[PDB]
């Protein structure tokens, strides 16, 4: 399947809740690395990175990010001045990463933002930087003269992918796991709406549908948002609000990884009945 490696850096001016610089590394959107300017140490966040990399790897990662912290410190001071906002609490963000497809083909991105809005973005096809506003144009010219786009593209297409392949091997079992949803039909009151709740599944893609008697039914259906669990799994629910349900046989069908689970009215649970 497709896999990705992504880094997200957060720079902050003025405390206290968070340090000046925070970095998080993720494979398939799951954190495997952490760093901040309080501890000045890069640390592992998953078993698979722990068991496959050690002191040398982390010393180097720490060293790179200490530099990142220093650069972010200087960068945010500059952009704040350009917005004449140097007094208040502000933010400087960087996200970049690569994707490796079954294909063998790859994708990559490199972006920066100030106060949560686009500043400069990499176009690795034209090897230029897209400036979102006048404040970013000076940076665009500077970076294009320093060949930053060429270096970034080089990293995204080579270094990033080479390490992603390593990481995928390290955590193959976890990253390629397929966990079916646990499904329940919830109802507060015999007269209340009924919720089809699916949880503990991975990957996050899931489809919840209602049927009446039935071939499927999508009137009076409220599909909720995909939500993250605390353990890296996901959950999602859908609510049915229909008229007195009594004379018609409703059911919930949850599909995940080409497999379906059905729950009927006989399955409905509640507090305290």
């Amino acid at each position: 399947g497709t896999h990705s490696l992504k880094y997200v850096y957060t720079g902050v001016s003025r405390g206290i809740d968070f340090p000046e610089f925070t970095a998080v590394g993720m494979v398939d959107d799951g954190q495997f690395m952490y760093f901040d300017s309080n501890s000045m140490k890069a640390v592992p966040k998953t078993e698979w990175i722990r068991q496959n990399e050690g002191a040398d790897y982390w010393d180097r990662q720490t060293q790179v990010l200490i530099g990142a912290h220093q650069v972010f410190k200087d960068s945010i001071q500059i952009v704040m001045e350009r917005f004449n906002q140097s007094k208040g609490v502000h933010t400087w963000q960087n996200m970049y990463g690569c994707e490796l497809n079954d294909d063998g083909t790859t994708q990559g991105f490199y972006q920066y933002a100030y106060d949560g809005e686009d500043f400069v973005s990499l176009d690795k096809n034209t090897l230029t930087w897209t400036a979102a506003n006048p404040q970013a144009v000076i940076t665009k010219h500077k970076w294009e003269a320093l060949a930053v786009a060429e270096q970034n593209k080089g990293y995204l297409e080579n270094t990033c992918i080479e390490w992603l392949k390593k990481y995928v091997a390290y955590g193959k079992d976890t990253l390629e796991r397929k966990v079916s949803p646990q499904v329940s039909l919830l109802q507060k009151d015999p007269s209340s709406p009924v919720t089809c709740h699916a949880t503990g599944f991975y990957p996050s893609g899931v489809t919840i549908t209602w049927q009446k008697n039935g071939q499927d039914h999508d009137e009076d259906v409220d599909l909720g948002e995909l939500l993250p669990n605390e353990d890296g799994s996901f959950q999602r629910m859908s609510t049915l609000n229909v008229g007195p349900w009594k004379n018609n046989r409703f059911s919930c069908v949850v599909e995940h990884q080409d497999k379906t689970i059905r729950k009927t009215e006989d399955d409905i649970i509640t507090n305290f009945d």
Binding site: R60, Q151, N152, T159
Partner: peptide, 9 residues
Amino acid sequence: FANFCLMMI
């Protein structure tokens, strides 16, 4: 592994 090369804006 993080990109070792950064430039200030």
